[PDB]
Amino acid sequence: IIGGEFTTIENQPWFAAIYRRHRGGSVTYVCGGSLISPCWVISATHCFIDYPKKEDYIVYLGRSRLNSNTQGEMKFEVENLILHKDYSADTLAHHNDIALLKIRSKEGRCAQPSRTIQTIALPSMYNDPQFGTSCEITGFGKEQSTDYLYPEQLKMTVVKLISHRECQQPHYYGSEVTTKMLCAADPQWKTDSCQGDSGGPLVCSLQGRMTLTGIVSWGRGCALKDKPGVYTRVSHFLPWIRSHT
Ligand SMILES: *C(=O)c1ccc(NC(=N)N)cc1
Numbered sequence: 001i002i003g004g005e006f007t008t009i010e011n012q013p014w015f016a017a018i019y020r021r022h023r024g025g026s027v028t029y030v031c032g033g034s035l036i037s038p039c040w041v042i043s044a045t046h047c048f049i050d051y052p053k054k055e056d057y058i059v060y061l062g063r064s065r066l067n068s069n070t071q072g073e074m075k076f077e078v079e080n081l082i083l084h085k086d087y088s089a090d091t092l093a094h095h096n097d098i099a100l101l102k103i104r105s106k107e108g109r110c111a112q113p114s115r116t117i118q119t120i121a122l123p124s125m126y127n128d129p130q131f132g133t134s135c136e137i138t139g140f141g142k143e144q145s146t147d148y149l150y151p152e153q154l155k156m157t158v159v160k161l162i163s164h165r166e167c168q169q170p171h172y173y174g175s176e177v178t179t180k181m182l183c184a185a186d187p188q189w190k191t192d193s194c195q196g197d198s199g200g201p202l203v204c205s206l207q208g209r210m211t212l213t214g215i216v217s218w219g220r221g222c223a224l225k226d227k228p229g230v231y232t233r234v235s236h237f238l239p240w241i242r243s244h245t
Pocket residue numbers: 192193194195196197198199216217218219220221222223224227228229230
């Protein structure tokens with residue numbers, strides 16, 4: 001997260017921290033995700049495409065810190081890693097950038113809700129907030145494009161939804177953005193998602209309910225003028241989620 005503020009898991013209790021075990025046993029952070037039901041975390045296919053083996057992955061819920069255990073956290077194996085079979089990636093844009101992880105602890109159990117573990121509601125089909133709406137993004141991604149390290153503490157920021165029209169403009173993304181993507185950015189371009197934030201949630205309040213409107217997907221750099229963050233438009237993927245859960 002470029003700019004924004006530090007947070008703890010209590011403020012985004014659906015947030016999933018996804019890590020990969022490397023050959024040799026070393027564990028590195030991969031991507032965020034969101035808990036949509038006790039047994040299901042939703043993320044981005046781009047996070048997993050180079051290493052598609054479900055056994056390589058570890059999912060935490062209730063975790064506020066990157067490389068320290070948060071009190072109350074729960075740790076899961078991935079029992080099913082479902083990548084979108086129509087996923088495609090150009091030099092920047094990711095298409096159908098959506099993935100489902102069925103989670104199962106060593107004791108053979110799904111998430112158990114708590115102060116630090118809750119589900120996030122899915123949108124109603126094609127039901128998205130109007131452009132200019134303020135939404136929140138959460139992740140362990142870089143605080144600056146030039147950073148080597150990821151923050152140890154979880155971060156959040158606010159970005160505003162941008163219309164398909166505006167995002168299609170020449171100096172923005174042109175035809176790279178489709179109607180299955182949502183753009184969001186800061187008016188001053190001062191806060192954004194960055195490397196490490198992908199797979200994570202874009203949450204909007206829709207008719208009074210906190211809704212997973214988006215999945216952090218792609219962008220040209222981070223917090224660059226006329227280069228919004230691009231999100232998987234979740235309200236356009238309900239059939240795929242339905243048929244795989
Ligand atoms: C994901 O890792 C990711 C998503 C989006 C960006 N860029 C912007 N939001 N501009 C970088 C990395």
